[PDB]
Design a protein around this ligand. Structure first.
Ligand SMILES: COc1cc2c(cc1OC)CN(CCc1ccc(NC(=O)c3cc(OC)c(OC)cc3NC(=O)c3cnc4ccccc4c3)cc1)CC2
Ligand SMILES: COc1cc2c(cc1OC)CN(CCc1ccc(NC(=O)c3cc(OC)c(OC)cc3NC(=O)c3cnc4ccccc4c3)cc1)CC2
Ligand SMILES: CC(C)CCC[C@@H](C)[C@H]1CC[C@H]2[C@@H]3CC=C4C[C@@H](O)CC[C@]4(C)[C@H]3CC[C@]12C
Ligand SMILES: CC(C)CCC[C@@H](C)[C@H]1CC[C@H]2[C@@H]3CC=C4C[C@@H](O)CC[C@]4(C)[C@H]3CC[C@]12C
Ligand SMILES: CC(C)CCC[C@@H](C)[C@H]1CC[C@H]2[C@@H]3CC=C4C[C@@H](O)CC[C@]4(C)[C@H]3CC[C@]12C
Ligand SMILES: CC(C)CCC[C@@H](C)[C@H]1CC[C@H]2[C@@H]3CC=C4C[C@@H](O)CC[C@]4(C)[C@H]3CC[C@]12C
Ligand SMILES: CC(C)CCC[C@@H](C)[C@H]1CC[C@H]2[C@@H]3CC=C4C[C@@H](O)CC[C@]4(C)[C@H]3CC[C@]12C
Ligand SMILES: CC(C)CCC[C@@H](C)[C@H]1CC[C@H]2[C@@H]3CC=C4C[C@@H](O)CC[C@]4(C)[C@H]3CC[C@]12C
Ligand SMILES: CC(C)CCC[C@@H](C)[C@H]1CC[C@H]2[C@@H]3CC=C4C[C@@H](O)CC[C@]4(C)[C@H]3CC[C@]12C
Ligand SMILES: CC(C)CCC[C@@H](C)[C@H]1CC[C@H]2[C@@H]3CC=C4C[C@@H](O)CC[C@]4(C)[C@H]3CC[C@]12C
Ligand SMILES: CC(C)CCC[C@@H](C)[C@H]1CC[C@H]2[C@@H]3CC=C4C[C@@H](O)CC[C@]4(C)[C@H]3CC[C@]12C
Ligand SMILES: CC(C)CCC[C@@H](C)[C@H]1CC[C@H]2[C@@H]3CC=C4C[C@@H](O)CC[C@]4(C)[C@H]3CC[C@]12C
Ligand SMILES: CC(C)CCC[C@@H](C)[C@H]1CC[C@H]2[C@@H]3CC=C4C[C@@H](O)CC[C@]4(C)[C@H]3CC[C@]12C
Lengths: 218, 214, 1164
């Protein structure tokens, strides 16, 4: 099928310049229009650019014009969006896109990359275990938790036991307050699981190279 | 500039029936050549939006034939029928007729189900956090319905704290329930000064911790 | 003219009707080959688009379409062949028939009718009209039908695929078809236009190159050159205007084609993006309709050719149908048995229908018995030859009735009467065939014993015994190989082999000596006893032994009786008897170097025309690609508008480039041709006369060289440069772009490029209708038809229609057998090359689908390689066909250089030599011998000598052709003798100045010649490098007694005289010749036949100016009339170039010699 894979982005300061490149494989890339679409944290969507196939036609909405350039390198099937002068509002998730014959603009979306534009030093999160009072025997189950606080930017990863625990997980969306993010996750395991074998909370904050595994103990 | 507005934003629907979304487009969106060029998109919770219809009547190759679409001039609609829990997400309209291109506001879907009480759980602050001068008590309200639920924090029983940080997950695709966490954040000193705090979900659902550590 | 359409195909068997029907069906099928190809291609493009957008099925589908293409290929192969060959065959046969019958009809014709039309024009007319008819009938009709089919198939395909786009292209189609017609006409007629432009000059060139010896005698070479320069300027201006117009029209045609591409693709993108039509369907419709509307343009050369054929056909079928009053072959003619010699003429009045206003004959009555030798005496002008021609029924008398032995000629067969009258006319001419055949030309079945008897009667066996090939000697043209006496003796034998019943001699011993004339007359009296005989001669030695002598006067036979009867009658005959008792070089551009600017610009535009083919591919490919790729609508609309604009811009710059290339190279050709014609003409005027003697150089070869070689040098240089440049651009760029984009396909198409180029060339030659090699070769068989009518002597001697009609047919039979082989070979060559185009279309696109399949190259690339290479090759072919052959033009430039750098013996511009300030006027010839450079074996002179003093009227009397004008050409520096010594007042002429001797003297020519200008100027002609006063003009006109005829004429001194004074009479033009010589005031004056055609009162008024002006100047008069000879000072008589008698006239009258026989001839 069509594999689209974005890379670049991350954290940048206003007036800054970044380069997002989306490697595209499987569909003779040199013959398809390619667009770039964006989605903001308010959950709205917008359009950010298109570029014709191996050609010079580029389109832009008024905002991004003059500040955003779009290009494609067919030698390796790559698509590069180069942003500059980043206003504080372009914080967003950027998806590549492909063009479907029979005129259906965005057919196959690649995976989104996250770009954050704000004047704030990368803050590492504080990971705290969450357990009941001395391992309370609740019904026939035990609910554990993990609390990451004081983290920025938003991209953060949380798994239980390197991904072993996935059946009873509840990762809650991060809430922003005072230029710092707070996120939490729960996991529900039977009473015969946690006190016997310890559960560990795996947290990764790429922007500060933070990676910590906090075991949940009673 | 064309502005696209979807009438129904929160369209909750019973499992098994037919649900319809309606998007109204100004300026009678019509390309020069003669094609309306209005498309719909679906986005599942935690995934990248995908194509449903590349035209008002045409359906993208790979879409169940229960998704129908119908549209005349400056008005368009989408009829989903036989709602199935895999059809839960957000629905967007895109128009490429005019020289700028604009997605409409998202519309959210909801699989109507029966009521369900949350499995409440309260957690005292960790020792490490108390060492750094903070004390955050976290309460989990997992797998309930509907989303409209209150949570009250009660320190020393009588007090009602209000500096809490709530967070809801989107409706789960398996059981269609909701989950929320309430994190009451106070200082280590204000916390060491009391030892009676609970978490009430609203005949409420009470949960409390006798002491800070055990 | 344009009548009897069905009659032109009158000479058509059944097989040719079959050939024509089958050929036209094959034509229509050929015509439905291009359109269907465009349909298949328009579907293949849909397949490539869909499969690319997705493609493992691609290859398989393309296999199918490859079959389809190959299918059509084979079809268009067979149809093509059957068309061309068959039509050619039809034309071939018909032409042959027409040819063979035409000459037959030409052979039999009343002699009066023959007088009305020129021999040269008629002879040319046969061949040229037949070639024009054949050009029509052969292929123009088949190509018309092919074009008609291609057009209708195109429009129907265009209307079934999609009707809206084909409506639009119908809307702009008239302008397209008219462009095609104009362009085709131009390419076909570009070579013809030049021949029409140059004609006015060519006339004057021909006049003055004809009368070279005269104009040289008058020094008026410079003035003549001026006239020629004027006509050249006019020809240059006409040619330049025609070049501007041809090239503006071709430029506009290209601009229109490119604007049509731009319109069609703009509208085609509106449709495709609207969803109505696919891209391959737009391609189908557009190309079918464009090609169908270009086919209409090709029809016009075919329709024009047919009109021409009809025109020439009318004038040839008139000559065929024309039934003369007197036929040469009659089956109804009554033939007699007991043929006894008896002649009856009574009240015979007849006049020549060439000049019917004058009546030479006013009735003659004669009765001649058998064995009666009748001689007729009288001065030249009564018509002895007229009676001879009246005898053989070459005409009919307007009054009375003639009869031979009782019954009249008017009811009896003509051929049977013509065979039994052996006649020898005034001049004999030996045919080219062997002497055995010539003597055999009397009758059919003669053996060599009768031949030997007849030649021994003719006493012409000694010179047969001395020369090799005693019965196998091929005598040259017009009896030039042998002497005149041998000629007339063998002509007597040629008459005698018929064994006739009535013998008629007309001046049978004109140039014959004594003993041979004697033995011939003895032989004539040897065979006169069984036959009737009539002898006409000037020598009275063969007349005195006749039966009856008679005398003409004003056409009426006045005196009759025997010798002694006319003796006692004391008439004119009594007075007569009383008085009697390689290397070629590349220096053909070094002469046009001065024009290098025009070439540089012309090379530049040249490259640009060549470069256009690749650009048009790169955009064409790309434009189709705008619908192959997967983009949004707006990108497709913008890129299609951009490439349509590029189509418009390519058209505008094509217009500008074609106009400039044409205009510049065309003015280069014009200027080169002008300068070459002028310089060659100048060097021809300066050239000596002996050079005009040589048989290799003739009056016509020079005119033909002037009008062809000077015109082909421009081709040899300019066209070569422009062709190599256009082609190198158009093919180098194409093969390089194709090498870059995809090499696998480019090798496969490079393997075929040769055949596509050759196919373009072959199609260009079909359109250009290049003249047929077969007739060009067959020219060898035309000299028979030329000679067999030119002679008109044996044809009169014997009807000879069978012998020469059959020799012509037989010589014609050999090229006919070659013409059919040519028709088959050329049909096959045409069919194979076109079929190869279609198969190339299949194989290229199949290999391209395999390549696209394995992701080696895109579809735009296979399309760009196809266009830029295949059609680049076809354009290489067409443009290399337009180029003239380089070998012909290179040899021709070498010929022109040979003439230009030729050095003349007797320089005419130099002033070096002996220039004395004074002279006296005495001339002294001693031991002068002269042989003609064209006749090195025959000496006309044998060491003459002469002494002339001041004012000595020196008469020169002799036979016709004894060196009479030779002494003139020896004086006027025409031919310098090999031996002898000439002293001009003790000053040798070989050391003096060349133009001083030609400036001093002045002569009247042997025949008066007049330039094409006014009579006052024409009479004045004679003095140059001098302000010509009109008082001397009117004084000379009064002294020559021409002032009356000039002052009588309207626009008296501005009256335009035609070529060689053909408007006014002979005595007047001879008189104005006298007034031309008179303005020279020569101290040495020569007269050559001053009274050839002049009245008796005009001879005195001419001679009075001479006698009053003979003092002071040496005068030398040569004439046959004794009136100016009696009053001469000294008289010289010649005999085979030897001075026999000289001195005073009384001394020659005292000692009776040959001058006594000369003087006393008609006096008393
Ligand atoms: C396989 O082909 C065929 C070839 C022939 C025939 C039939 C065919 O069957 C079809 C029959 N005989 C005569 C018909 C004919 C018609 C026109 C031309 N000469 C141009 O057409 C042309 C002239 C330009 O200069 C004067 C020029 O550049 C300025 C661009 C020109 N044309 C193109 O480039 C072109 C046009 N259509 C194409 C369609 C598909 C693929 C490639 C294409 C390329 C030559 C001969 C002889 C060859
Ligand atoms: C004094 O200086 C010089 C001046 C000149 C020359 C040489 C000179 O010096 C030595 C030579 N020059 C010759 C140029 C030339 C050669 C051959 C053709 N022959 C066809 O054009 C054609 C014939 C068809 O049959 C008779 C036919 O049949 C249907 C379709 C034909 N053409 C097409 O179809 C077609 C198709 N697409 C086109 C696209 C763009 C542009 C043209 C297109 C044409 C046209 C022009 C003219 C000026
Ligand atoms: C010169 C012709 C008339 C004789 C040769 C055989 C002809 C009749 C055959 C050979 C190939 C055939 C064509 C091949 C493919 C197509 C495309 C299809 O969509 C319509 C029919 C059509 C156009 C066929 C018509 C008939 C055809 C042209
Ligand atoms: C004198 C002329 C008209 C005779 C030529 C015969 C031609 C015109 C005939 C013979 C075969 C016919 C074709 C056969 C098949 C098709 C396919 C169809 O989808 C369009 C019409 C089309 C393309 C026909 C057009 C007309 C046609 C090409
Ligand atoms: C003298 C000139 C105008 C003759 C031109 C031919 C005319 C009669 C033809 C050729 C092209 C044709 C036009 C081409 C296409 C269309 C689109 C159609 O939906 C309406 C008719 C219309 C606009 C046609 C009208 C008639 C038309 C203009
Ligand atoms: C004979 C020529 C030189 C004069 C003009 C004729 C051509 C160019 C004219 C005649 C009819 C015209 C067409 C009439 C209608 C339409 C339909 C429209 O949607 C596009 C323009 C178009 C296609 C016009 C293009 C120009 C046109 C084709
Ligand atoms: C006389 C015949 C040949 C008609 C010639 C007129 C042609 C050349 C005219 C008629 C319509 C014109 C087109 C109309 C509009 C556009 C859009 C513009 O963005 C590019 C030029 C373009 C594409 C024009 C090209 C020139 C055009 C095609
Ligand atoms: C430049 C590269 C890529 C390709 C060029 C190859 C050359 C050698 C080819 C391409 C075009 C060819 C020319 C095309 C036509 C002619 C005219 C002919 O009367 C003489 C040969 C001549 C002059 C050819 C000579 C060879 C030629 C010049
Ligand atoms: C113009 C003429 C002489 C061309 C000569 C044809 C021969 C020599 C060329 C032309 C096309 C070529 C073939 C085209 C493609 C393939 C498929 C590949 O998997 C094996 C080689 C093979 C089979 C090539 C072999 C050589 C080939 C057949
Ligand atoms: C006429 C002369 C100059 C060239 C003859 C054409 C031949 C040699 C060309 C045409 C197509 C070409 C072939 C196309 C593809 C292949 C397949 C590869 O595995 C070997 C090379 C080979 C086989 C190419 C060799 C050269 C080739 C065969
Ligand atoms: C280096 C590449 C171009 C090799 C291919 C050589 C080809 C394209 C060149 C070389 C010799 C050229 C040929 C030389 C002779 C003639 C005869 C002439 O009346 C028509 C053109 C034609 C047929 C030329 C066509 C192009 C030609 C075949
Ligand atoms: C120029 C024409 C007249 C002669 C050459 C015709 C070409 C097109 C023919 C001859 C040999 C053929 C090839 C023979 C073998 C193969 C290998 C196969 O796996 C792909 C097709 C392919 C490549 C064929 C394609 C068509 C082909 C290349
Ligand atoms: C030159 C004349 C006299 C003989 C005929 C030549 C023929 C036999 C040649 C010329 C073009 C060739 C065709 C070109 C392409 C293909 C497609 C391939 O998939 C099958 C073979 C096939 C169909 C070839 C068969 C042979 C072919 C048809």
């Amino acid at each position: 099928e069509v594999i689209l894979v974005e890379s670049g982005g991350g954290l940048v300061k206003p007036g800054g310049s970044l380069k997002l490149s989306c490697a595209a494989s499987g569909f003779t890339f040199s013959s398809y229009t390619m667009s770039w679409v964006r989605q903001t944290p308010e959950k709205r969507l917008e359009w950010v650019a298109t570029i014709s196939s191996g050609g010079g036609n580029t389109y832009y909405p008024d905002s991004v014009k003059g500040r955003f350039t779009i290009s494609r390198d067919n030698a390796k099937n790559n698509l590069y969006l180069q942003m500059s002068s980043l206003r504080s509002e372009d914080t967003a998730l950027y998806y590549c896109a492909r063009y479907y014959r029979y005129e259906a603009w965005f057919a196959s979306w690649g995976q989104g990359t996250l770009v954050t534009v704000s004047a704030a030093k990368t803050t590492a999160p504080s990971v705290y275990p969450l357990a009941p009072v001395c391992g309370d025997t609740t019904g026939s189950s035990v609910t554990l938790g993990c609390l990451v606080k004081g983290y920025f930017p938003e991209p953060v990863t949380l798994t239980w036991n390197s991904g072993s625990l996935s059946s009873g997980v509840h990762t809650f969306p991060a809430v922003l307050q005072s230029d710092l993010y707070t996120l939490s996750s729960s996991v529900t395991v039977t009473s015969s699981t946690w006190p016997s074998q310890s559960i560990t909370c795996n947290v990764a904050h790429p922007a500060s190279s933070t990676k910590v595994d906090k075991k949940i103990e009673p | 500039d064309v502005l696209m507005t979807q009438t129904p934003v929160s369209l909750s629907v019973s499992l098994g029936d037919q649900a319809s979304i309606s998007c109204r487009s100004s300026q009678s969106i019509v390309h020069s050549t003669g094609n309306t060029y209005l498309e719909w998109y679906l986005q599942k919770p935690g995934q990248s939006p995908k194509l449903l219809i590349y035209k008002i009547s045409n359906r993208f190759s790979g879409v169940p034939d229960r998704f129908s679409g119908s549209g005349s001039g400056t008005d368009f609609t989408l009829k989903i029928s036989r709602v199935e829990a895999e059809d839960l997400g957000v629905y967007y309209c895109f128009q490429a007729s005019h020289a700028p291109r604009t997605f409409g506001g998202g519309t959210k879907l909801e699989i109507k189900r029966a009521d369900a009480a949350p499995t409440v759980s309260i957690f005292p602050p960790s020792s490490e956090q108390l060492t750094s001068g903070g004390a955050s008590v976290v309460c989990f309200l997992n797998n309930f319905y509907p989303k409209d639920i209150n949570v009250k924090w009660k320190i020393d029983g009588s007090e009602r704290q209000n500096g809490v940080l709530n967070s809801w997950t989107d409706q789960d695709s398996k059981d269609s329930t909701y989950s929320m966490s309430s994190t009451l954040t106070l200082t280590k000193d204000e916390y060491e000064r009391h030892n009676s705090y609970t978490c009430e979900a609203t005949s409420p659902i009470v949960k409390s911790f006798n002491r800070n550590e055990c | 003219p344009t009548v009897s359409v069905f009659s032109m195909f009158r000479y058509s068997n059944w097989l040719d009707k079959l050939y024509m029907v089958v050929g036209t069906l094959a034509a229509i099928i050929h015509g439905a080959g291009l359109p269907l190809m465009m349909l298949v291609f328009g579907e293949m493009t849909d397949i490539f688009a869909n499969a690319g957008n997705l493609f493992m099925n691609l290859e398989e589908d393309m296999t199918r379409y490859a079959y389809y293409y190959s299918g059509i290929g084979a079809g268009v192969l067979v149809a093509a062949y059957i068309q061309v060959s068959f039509w050619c065959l039809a034309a071939g046969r018909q032409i042959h028939k027409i040819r063979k019958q035409f000459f037959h009809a030409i052979m039999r014709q009343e002699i009066g009718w023959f007088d009305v039309h020129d021999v040269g024009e008629l002879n040319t007319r046969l061949t040229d009209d037949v070639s024009k008819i054949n050009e029509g009938i052969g292929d123009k009709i088949g190509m018309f039908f092919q074009s008609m089919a291609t057009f209708f198939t195109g429009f129907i395909v265009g209307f079934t695929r999609g009707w809206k786009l084909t409506l639009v292209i119908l809307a702009i189609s008239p302008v397209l078809g008219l462009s095609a017609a104009v362009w085709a006409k131009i390419l076909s007629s570009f070579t013809d236009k030049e021949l029409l432009a140059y004609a006015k000059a060519g006339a004057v060139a021909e006049e003055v190159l004809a009368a070279i010896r005269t104009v040289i005698a008058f020094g008026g070479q410079k003035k003549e050159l001026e006239r020629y320069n004027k006509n050249l300027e006019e020809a240059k201006r006409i040619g330049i205007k025609k070049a501007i117009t041809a090239n503006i029209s071709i430029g506009a045609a290209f601009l229109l084609i490119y604007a049509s591409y731009a319109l069609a693709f703009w509208y085609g993108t509106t449709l495709v993006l609207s969803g109505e039509y696919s891209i391959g369907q737009v391609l189908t419709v557009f190309f079918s309709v464009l090609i169908g509307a270009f086919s209409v343009g090709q029809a016009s050369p075919s329709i024009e050719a047919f009109a021409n054929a009809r025109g020439a056909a009318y004038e040839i079928f008139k000559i065929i149908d024309n039934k003369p009053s007197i036929d040469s072959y009659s089956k109804s003619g009554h033939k007699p048995d007991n043929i006894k010699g008896n002649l009856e003429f009574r009240n015979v009045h007849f006049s020549y229908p060439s000049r019917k206003e004058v009546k030479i004959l006013k009735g003659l009555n004669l009765k001649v018995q058998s064995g009666q030798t009748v001689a007729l005496v009288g001065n030249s002008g009564c018509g002895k030859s007229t009676t001879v021609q009246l005898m053989q029924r070459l005409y009919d008398p307007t009054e009375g009735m003639v009869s031979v032995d009782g019954q009249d000629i008017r009811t009896i067969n003509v051929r049977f009467l013509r065979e039994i009258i052996g006649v020898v006319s005034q001049e004999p001419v030996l045919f080219a065939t062997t002497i055995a055949e010539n003597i055999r030309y009397g009758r059919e079945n003669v053996t060599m014993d009768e031949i030997e008897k007849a030649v021994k009667e003719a006493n012409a066996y000694d010179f047969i015994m001395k020369l090799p090939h005693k019965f196998d000697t091929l005598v040259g043209e017009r009896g030039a190989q042998l002497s005149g006496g041998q000629k007339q003796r063998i002509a007597i034998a040629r008459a005698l082999v018929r064994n006739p019943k009535i013998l008629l001699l007309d001046e049978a011993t004109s140039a014959l000596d004594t003993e041979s004339e004697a033995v011939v007359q003895v032989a004539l009296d040897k065979a006169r006893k069984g036959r009737t005989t009539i002898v006409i001669a000037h020598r009275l030695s063969t007349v005195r032994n006749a039966d009856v002598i008679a005398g003409f006067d004003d056409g009426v036979i006045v005196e009759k009786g025997n010798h002694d009867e006319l003796m006692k009658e004391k008439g004119i005959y009594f007075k007569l008897v009383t008085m009697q008792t390689p290397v070629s070089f590349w220096r053909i551009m070094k002469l046009n170097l001065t024009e290098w600017p025009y070439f540089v610009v012309g090379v530049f535009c040249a490259i640009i025309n060549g470069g256009l083919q690749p650009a048009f591919a790169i955009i064409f490919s790309k434009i189709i690609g705008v619908f192959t790729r997967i983009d949004d609508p707006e990108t497709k609309r913008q890129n299609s508008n951009l490439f349509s604009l590029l189509f418009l811009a390519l058209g505008i710059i094509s217009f500008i480039t074609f106009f400039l290339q044409g205009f510049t190279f065309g003015k280069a050709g014009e200027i080169l041709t002008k300068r070459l014609r002028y310089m060659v003409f100048r060097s021809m005027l300066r050239q000596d006369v002996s050079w005009f003697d040589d048989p290799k150089n003739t009056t016509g070869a020079l005119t033909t060289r002037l009008a062809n070689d000077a015109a082909q040098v421009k081709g040899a240089i300019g066209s070569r440069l422009a062709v190599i440049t256009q082609n190198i651009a158009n093919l180098g760029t194409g093969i390089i772009i194709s090498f870059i984009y995809g090499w696998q396909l480019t090798l496969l198409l490079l393997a075929i490029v040769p055949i596509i180029a050759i196919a373009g060339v072959v199609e260009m030659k079909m359109l250009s209708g290049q003249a047929l090699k077969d007739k060009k070769e067959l020219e060898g068989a035309g000299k028979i038809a030329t000679e067999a009518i030119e002679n008109f002597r044996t044809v009169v001697s014997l009807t000879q229609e069978q012998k020469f009609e059959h020799m012509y047919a037989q010589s014609l039979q050999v090229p006919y057998r070659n013409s059919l082989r040519k028709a088959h070979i050329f049909g096959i060559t045409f069919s194979f090359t076109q079929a190869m185009m279609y198969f190339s279309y299949a194989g290229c696109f199949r290999f391209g689908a395999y390549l696209v399949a394995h992701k080696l190259m895109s579809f735009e690339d296979v399309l760009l390689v196809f266009s830029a290479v295949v059609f680049g090759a076809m354009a290489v072919g067409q443009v290399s066909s337009f180029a003239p052959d380089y070998a012909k033009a290179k040899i021709s430039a070498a010929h022109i250089i040979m003439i230009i750098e030729k050095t003349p013996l007797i320089d005419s511009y130099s002033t070096e030599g002996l220039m004395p300030n004074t002279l006296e006027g005495n001339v002294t010839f001693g031991e002068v011998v002269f042989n003609y450079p064209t006749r090195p074996d025959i000496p006309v002179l044998q060491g003459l000598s002469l002494e002339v003093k001041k004012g000595q009227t020196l008469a020169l009397v002799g036979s016709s052709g004894c060196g009479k004008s030779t002494v003139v050409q020896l004086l006027e520096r025409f031919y310098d003798p090999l031996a002898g010594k000439v002293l001009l007042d003790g000053k040798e002429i070989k050391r003096l100045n060349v133009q001083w001797l030609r400036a001093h003297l002045g002569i009247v020519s042997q025949e008066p010649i007049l330039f094409d200008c006014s009579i006052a100027e024409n009479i004045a002609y004679g003095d140059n490098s001098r302000v010509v006063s009109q008082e001397e003009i009117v004084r000379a006109a009064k002294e020559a007694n021409i002032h009356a005829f000039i002052e009588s004429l309207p626009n008296k001194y501005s009256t335009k005289v035609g070529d060689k004074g053909t408007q006014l009479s002979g005595g007047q033009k001879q008189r104005i010749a006298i007034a031309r010589a008179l303005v020279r005031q020569p101290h040495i004056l020569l007269l050559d036949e001053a009274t050839s055609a002049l009245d008796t009162e005009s001879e005195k008024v001419v001679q009075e100016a001479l006698d009053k002006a003979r003092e002071g100047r040496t005068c030398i008069v040569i004439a046959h009339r004794l009136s100016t000879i009696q009053n001469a000072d000294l008289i010289v008589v010649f005999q085979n170039g030897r001075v026999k008698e000289h001195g005073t006239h009384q001394q020659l009258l005292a000692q009776k010699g040959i001058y006594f026989s000369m003087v006393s001839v008609q006096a008393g």
